[PDB]
Every structure is written in C-alpha cells, then in structure tokens.
Design a protein around this motif. Structure first.
Motif, short mmCIF file in Angstrom:
data_model
loop_
_atom_site.label_atom_id
_atom_site.label_comp_id
_atom_site.label_asym_id
_atom_site.label_seq_id
_atom_site.Cartn_x
_atom_site.Cartn_y
_atom_site.Cartn_z
N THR A 156 1.00 -1.17 -0.04
CA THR A 156 0.04 0.04 0.00
C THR A 156 0.81 1.12 -0.07
OG1 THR A 156 -0.14 0.17 2.36
CG2 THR A 156 -1.71 -1.44 1.32
N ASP A 157 0.22 2.34 0.26
CA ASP A 157 1.00 3.52 0.69
C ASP A 157 0.12 4.29 1.54
OD1 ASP A 157 -0.71 5.43 -0.97
OD2 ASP A 157 0.37 4.25 -2.71
N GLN A 158 0.42 5.66 1.85
CA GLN A 158 -0.32 6.29 2.79
C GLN A 158 -1.67 6.76 2.48
OE1 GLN A 158 1.07 11.16 2.37
NE2 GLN A 158 2.71 9.75 2.10
N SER A 159 -2.14 6.57 1.17
CA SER A 159 -3.57 6.54 0.99
C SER A 159 -4.32 5.47 1.86
CB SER A 159 -3.74 6.50 -0.56
OG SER A 159 -3.48 4.96 -1.02
N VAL A 160 -3.69 4.50 2.28
CA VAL A 160 -4.62 3.42 2.81
C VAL A 160 -5.06 4.02 4.28
CG1 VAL A 160 -2.70 2.69 4.47
CG2 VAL A 160 -4.20 1.17 3.37
N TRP A 161 -4.52 5.24 4.74
CA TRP A 161 -5.09 5.79 5.89
C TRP A 161 -6.34 6.89 5.77
CZ3 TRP A 161 -3.40 2.75 9.39
CH2 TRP A 161 -2.19 2.14 9.64
N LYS A 162 -6.83 7.23 4.30
CA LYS A 162 -7.67 8.11 4.23
C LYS A 162 -9.08 8.02 5.07
CE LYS A 162 -8.72 5.41 -0.08
NZ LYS A 162 -7.33 4.50 0.04
N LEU A 163 -9.28 6.91 5.50
CA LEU A 163 -10.49 6.91 6.36
C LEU A 163 -10.21 6.97 7.81
CD1 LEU A 163 -13.05 4.08 4.88
CD2 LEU A 163 -12.64 6.47 4.17
N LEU A 164 -8.72 6.83 8.36
CA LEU A 164 -8.74 7.06 9.77
C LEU A 164 -8.23 8.49 9.94
CD1 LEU A 164 -7.80 6.19 12.74
CD2 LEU A 164 -5.66 5.59 11.67
N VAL A 165 -7.46 9.03 9.13
CA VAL A 165 -7.13 10.44 9.38
C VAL A 165 -7.86 11.57 10.06
CG1 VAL A 165 -6.15 12.53 8.17
CG2 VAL A 165 -5.19 10.26 8.01
N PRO A 166 -9.17 11.77 9.07
CA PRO A 166 -10.09 12.80 9.70
C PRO A 166 -10.53 12.50 11.29
CG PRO A 166 -11.04 11.70 7.64
CD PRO A 166 -9.85 11.03 8.14
N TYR A 167 -10.67 11.39 11.71
CA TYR A 167 -10.89 11.41 13.32
C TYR A 167 -9.68 11.47 14.01
CZ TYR A 167 -14.51 8.68 11.03
OH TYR A 167 -15.70 8.13 10.44
N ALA B 228 -14.46 -2.43 -3.09
CA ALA B 228 -13.52 -1.44 -2.98
C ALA B 228 -12.09 -1.66 -2.42
CB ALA B 228 -14.16 -0.36 -2.10
N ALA B 229 -11.92 -2.42 -1.30
CA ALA B 229 -10.58 -2.59 -0.75
C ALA B 229 -9.84 -3.43 -1.71
CB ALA B 229 -10.93 -3.50 0.44
N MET B 230 -10.45 -4.38 -2.45
CA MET B 230 -9.40 -5.01 -3.27
C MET B 230 -9.15 -4.22 -4.33
SD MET B 230 -8.10 -8.07 -4.23
CE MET B 230 -8.90 -8.76 -2.73
N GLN B 231 -9.84 -3.47 -4.96
CA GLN B 231 -9.57 -2.68 -6.25
C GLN B 231 -8.47 -1.83 -5.71
OE1 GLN B 231 -12.35 -1.09 -8.64
NE2 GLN B 231 -14.10 -1.95 -8.23
N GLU B 232 -8.60 -1.14 -4.44
CA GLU B 232 -7.49 -0.41 -3.99
C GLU B 232 -6.08 -0.85 -3.76
OE1 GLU B 232 -6.71 2.78 -3.69
OE2 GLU B 232 -5.46 3.13 -1.94
N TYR B 233 -6.17 -1.86 -2.93
CA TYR B 233 -4.96 -2.66 -2.64
C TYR B 233 -4.07 -3.20 -4.01
CZ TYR B 233 -1.62 -6.09 -0.61
OH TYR B 233 -0.56 -6.93 -0.22
N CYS B 234 -4.90 -3.51 -5.03
CA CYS B 234 -4.17 -4.04 -6.43
C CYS B 234 -3.68 -2.68 -6.92
CB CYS B 234 -5.13 -4.75 -7.03
SG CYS B 234 -5.65 -6.43 -6.60
N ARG B 235 -4.40 -1.69 -6.86
CA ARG B 235 -3.89 -0.37 -7.28
C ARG B 235 -2.67 -0.10 -6.99
NH1 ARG B 235 -3.68 4.68 -5.93
NH2 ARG B 235 -4.75 4.55 -3.91
N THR B 236 -2.34 0.05 -5.65
CA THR B 236 -1.03 0.36 -4.95
C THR B 236 -0.20 -0.75 -5.31
OG1 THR B 236 -1.72 -0.24 -2.74
CG2 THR B 236 -2.34 1.90 -3.47
N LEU B 237 -0.49 -2.11 -4.73
CA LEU B 237 0.51 -3.14 -5.12
C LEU B 237 0.93 -3.30 -6.51
CD1 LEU B 237 1.55 -6.12 -3.97
CD2 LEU B 237 -0.63 -7.02 -4.80
N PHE B 238 0.18 -3.13 -7.55
CA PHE B 238 0.68 -3.22 -8.73
C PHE B 238 1.39 -1.92 -9.20
CE2 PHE B 238 -2.59 -6.41 -9.08
CZ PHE B 238 -1.68 -7.51 -8.97
N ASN B 239 1.25 -0.85 -8.45
CA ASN B 239 2.10 0.29 -8.72
C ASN B 239 3.55 0.44 -8.30
OD1 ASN B 239 1.64 3.19 -9.24
ND2 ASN B 239 1.93 3.75 -7.59
#
Length: 267
Positions: free
Chosen positions: A26-37, A167-178
């Motif tokens: 992953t990368d730091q986008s993986v925290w997008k849901l945690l940060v605002p709290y 959504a989770a799978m789509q995102e993980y493969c996004r960054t993993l294949f990046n």
C-alpha cells in the motif's frame, strides 16, 4: 529532500504527533478513512516507505532494503527531519516491526506503538507456529520471480479476506501493482525471511497489538506470543475481523479499535 523522497504529509494540530506508516503493498492513501478522526486532537505525519510505487525507483537501495532496519533508519531520519519526539506510531505489518526496531535504537522518539497485524516470523519451527512451513515458503520464494503477477492476483483475495469486487481489493491491487516487480519481490523476500523474536525482549516502549481473529499471515496465537515476549508494557486486541489489512477491508470495526488504542494508554 527526505520529505520529498517519502511524500511526507503533515496535517491536524496538537501537542502529540501521530505517525502513520503503511504496510507492504500500500501507501499512505491506505489511511484516508482514519485521518479525519485524528486531525482535531493530534498532528498527523504520514509518509511512504521506500519502494512504494509513489517513490522514485532510482532511490531504492536493493541491499539496504533487503533487511528490515533499512526502513527503521529511514523512519528515524524522517522523525529527526520533522522534529517529532515521543510520537504515537501506528503501523501495519512490517511497518510496525520496523518501528519496533527503530524504538530499540531511539526510544526517545516513541511514546507508544500501535501495531496492526504484526508478526515477528512467518516460517514455522517445531515450538513456534508462524503460519508457514519452510517448504511451502521456499518453493514459493524460489519461483516467485516468474509467477509474480499471477501469484499476487490469486493470493490477494485470501490475504485481504475480501471479494474481488470490493473497493478494498480494487485499492490494494492499485497500490500493489504500482510497485516495480523487482522492488516488490525484494521487499517480499525481506518480509518472508524475517525473524524478530531474538529482538522482542529489547523493545521497551508500550505496545498495542491489534489483530484479526482470522488472518492467514497472523495466527491468533502469535498475538499473545508478542505480549509475553515483548520487553515493555503490552496489550492485545483480537478483533472480530478477517484478513491481514483489516483497516483497509473492515474499517467499520477496525477504525474504532485503532482510535481507542491511540487515545488510551495501558500505562
């Protein structure tokens, strides 16, 4: 700059800094849901570890990153650069272990470690169950080079314990294949060849171990192994979740648990 090399991002405000380190693939986008709290109560420093697809290929040191402490030292240098002290480090997997190593060298940098699905070792011996027999691993690692993309497409749904649709799978493969595949296999080989049990007793900073109840990379007992063998204070929370990246795949359970261990101390 070390800030430019790691895409360092600074948000929120407060006396205490939360430092968010992403895990493998992953990368730091993986925290997008945690940060605002967090932004209301803490200042938040996010960063990308070297070899993430968002970092320069030319800055990846193959021999420096074939060992965990290459990241530990990178982490130390980020905190020094941005003048962070006694932070609350939140890591996933390898990231939390690198931080535990960093906390051995420089415990002034860490108030506490909040670790999501850590493991000190994947390969089994007779007396310690890590989740993988040495023969399955060595056979996979031996031929990991040629079968890279297909092995990770096929294992990601079981790693994440999620649907291909999600959504989770789509995102993980996004960054993993990046990532470039040669950088990825190096990091993979480092992670799979790891055994941090000799070092656990030297970690003294408080440790908050957060775990799925069913994680194919993290037997639930490995959780309790850490509380017993860690050198300082320790808690364990086995969440009613599934998969190795529950902050990405089950944020509805995971984020409330993460925030409590961030905001409450054992000690």
């Amino acid at each position: 700059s070390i800030g430019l090399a790691h895409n360092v991002t600074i948000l929120g405000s407060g006396e205490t800094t939360v430092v968010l380190g992403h895990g493998y693939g992953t990368d730091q986008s993986v925290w997008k849901l945690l940060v605002p709290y967090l932004v209301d109560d803490y200042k938040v420093l996010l960063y990308d570890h070297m070899g993430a697809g968002t970092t320069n290929p030319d800055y990846f040191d193959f021999d420096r990153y074939s060992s965990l402490e290459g990241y530990s030292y990178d982490l130390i240098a980020i905190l020094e650069e941005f003048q962070v002290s006694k932070c609350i480090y939140v890591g996933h997997s390898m990231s939390s272990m690198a931080a535990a190593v960093a906390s051995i060298f420089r415990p002034d940098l860490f108030h506490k470690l909040v670790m999501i699905s850590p493991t000190p070792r994947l390969i089994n011996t007779e007396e310690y169950y890590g989740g993988f027999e040495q023969k399955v691993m060595d056979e996979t690692l031996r031929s990991l080079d040629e079968n890279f993309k297909s092995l990770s497409l096929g294992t990601a749904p079981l790693l994440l314990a999620c649907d291909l649709e999600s959504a989770a799978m789509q995102e993980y493969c996004r960054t993993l294949f990046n990532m470039r595949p040669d950088i990825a296999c190096c990091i993979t080989r480092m992670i799979c060849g790891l055994d941090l049990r000799p070092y656990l007793g030297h970690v003294t900073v408080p440790c908050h171990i957060i775990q799925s109840s069913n994680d194919i990379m993290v037997p639930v007992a490995v959780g309790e192994y850490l509380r017993k063998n860690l050198g300082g204070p320790s808690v364990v929370e086995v969440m009613p979740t599934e998969g190795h990246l529950p902050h990405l795949s089950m944020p509805e359970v995971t984020i409330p648990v993460v925030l409590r261990h961030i905001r409450q101390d054992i000690t």
